[PDB]
């Protein structure tokens, strides 16, 4: 998320058992790190 230039990543790593789709249940994403990037962003990718 990008608020006030700040780029914040919330995250949570969960041990699961699944092969497709997203599991049921509820888990809140704890804040992980906030980055004072201050720049605008509109697009992204992934790395594999």
Partner 1 sequence: GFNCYFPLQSYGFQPTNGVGYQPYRVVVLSFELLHAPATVCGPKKSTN
Provide the binding-site residues for partner 1, judged by CB under 8 A.
Answer: 4-6, 36-39
* Closer residue to partner 1, CB minimum distance, 29 or 38: 38
- Tallying the residues shown for the chain, one arrives at 48
Q: What minimum distance in Å lies between the beta carbon of 36 and partner 1?
A: 4
Q: What minimum distance in Å lies between the beta carbon of 39 and partner 1?
A: 7
Provide the CB-side half-sphere exposure for 31 (13 A, CA). Answer: 6
The C-alpha torsion from 47 through 3 and 21 to 19, rounded to 10°, is 40
Q: What minimum distance in Å lies between the beta carbon of 25 and partner 1?
A: 35
């Amino acid at each position: 998320k990008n608020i006030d230039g700040y780029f914040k990543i919330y995250s949570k790593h969960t041990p699961i058992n699944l092969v497709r789709d997203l599991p049921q249940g509820f888990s809140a994403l704890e804040p992980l790190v906030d980055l004072p990037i201050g720049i605008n962003i509109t697009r992204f990718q992934t790395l594999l």
